[PDB]
Amino acid sequence: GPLGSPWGSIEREFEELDTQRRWQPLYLEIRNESHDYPHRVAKFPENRNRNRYRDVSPYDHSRVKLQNAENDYINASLVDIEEAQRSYILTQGPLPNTCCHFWLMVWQQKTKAVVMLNRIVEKESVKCAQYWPTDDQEMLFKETGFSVKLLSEDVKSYYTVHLLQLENINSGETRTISHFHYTTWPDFGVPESPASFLNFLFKVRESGSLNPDHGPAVIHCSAGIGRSGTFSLVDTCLVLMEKGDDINIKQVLLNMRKYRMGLIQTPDQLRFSYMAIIEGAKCIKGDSSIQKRWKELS
Ligand SMILES: O=C1CN(c2c(O)cc(-c3cnn4c3CCCC4)cc2F)S(=O)(=O)N1
């Protein structure tokens, strides 16, 4: 193979983009190369109060459908990358009248974890409804037949983990859902450091919630594309590298954009993605004696 390290091709490209100050031109290339696909159901008149933003819609070919409901629509997309054995659902922060649909989808898709990357209020606007209880009262969603109870809360400096009990009233069953809340990632911004984002991702991974024996994890922010796209791109690229593939980050992101529009919203969020993939690749453990020496020396 090549003479460089496993991350050497990506690291050289990052250094060149910095020296030539070409992050804004590269972002514009990606925008111009992203094709549009039909999103007709999202624009039905009966779905207008189910969309948070008029310009952010799921594509018809990859939207998640609600089962046994008169209206099957929710603003959510299935992003499945079988080269990585990874599947995610990316979705908007639910509105007061769509929290009931959010929990129905979580049940029907056999999801184990919800990853939340926004605050409820940001710059004096509401970005997402309060869809889980903060105290010991049960929170009822009568339109779809679900109730939710807080089981535990662990607060750290830049994220919080809640364990939640989700009850299906119609089937007489319950499940424990892990709720991973990143509390210090600003709208259209970046996390405080690669190290802080990576510690959060490794905690999500350690719970088993991203493994193929569970349904897809539900990832959301406010619109479900900027911060959510950054999180999913970094996780996918790290899986492919651990598998041994020689990856091109521009190509992976354009492929993921075929499943949901507009993933990654600023040039700085793109640059942060490169940084987190390089530093995470140095944390990979494996069997190769060569790869271990590269890690020590780097
Ligand atoms: O970093 C990020 C940025 N996000 C984000 C976004 O991408 C788009 C919009 C959006 C779409 N239409 N309109 C607005 C805002 C105001 C008026 C109209 C809002 C957002 F918070 S995000 O996806 O939540 N993660």
Curated annotation (Swiss-Prot):
Catalysed conversion reaction: O-phospho-L-tyrosyl-[protein] + H2O = L-tyrosyl-[protein] + phosphate
Modified residues (S-nitrosocysteine): 221
Leading EC class: hydrolase
Binding site for substrate: 187, 221-227, 265
Residues recorded as bearing Phosphoserine in the entry: 57, 298
EC number in record: 3.1.3.48
GO MF annotation, one: receptor tyrosine kinase binding
Tissues where this protein is expressed: Ubiquitously expressed. Isoform 2 is probably the major isoform. Isoform 1 is expressed in T-cells and in placenta.
Residue span, Tyrosine-protein phosphatase domain: 10-280
Single GO cellular component term: plasma membrane
Keywords, in A-Z order: Cell membrane, Cytoplasm, Endoplasmic reticulum, Hydrolase, Membrane, Nucleus, Phosphoprotein, Protein phosphatase, S-nitrosylation
Outcome of mutating residue 227 to M: Impairs phosphatase activity
Entry-annotated residues carrying Phosphotyrosine: 27, 73
A GO biological process held by the record: glucose homeostasis
Function in brief: Non-receptor type tyrosine-specific phosphatase that dephosphorylates receptor protein tyrosine kinases including INSR, EGFR, CSF1R, PDGFR. Also dephosphorylates non-receptor protein tyrosine kinases like JAK1, JAK2, JAK3, Src family kinases, STAT1, STAT3 and STAT6 either in the nucleus or the cytoplasm. Negatively regulates numerous signaling pathways and biological processes like hematopoiesis, inflammatory response, cell proliferation and differentiation, and glucose homeostasis. Plays a multifaceted and important role in the development of the immune system.
Subunit structure: Interacts with RMDN3. Isoform 1 interacts with TMED9. Isoform 1 interacts with STX17; dephosphorylates STX17. Interacts with ITGA1 (via cytoplasmic domain); activates the phosphatase activity towards EGFR. Interacts with TRAF2; probably involved in tumor necrosis factor-mediated signaling. Interacts with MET. Interacts with FAM220A and STAT3; interaction with FAM220A promotes interaction of PTPN2 with transcriptional activator STAT3, leading to dephosphorylation of STAT3 by PTPN2 and negative regulation of STAT3 transcriptional activator activity.
Protein name per the record: Tyrosine-protein phosphatase non-receptor type 2
Organism: Homo sapiens (Human)
Lineage, top ranks: Eukaryota, Metazoa, Chordata, Craniata, Vertebrata
Gene name linked to the record: PTPN2
Full protein stretch here: 5 to 293 of 415
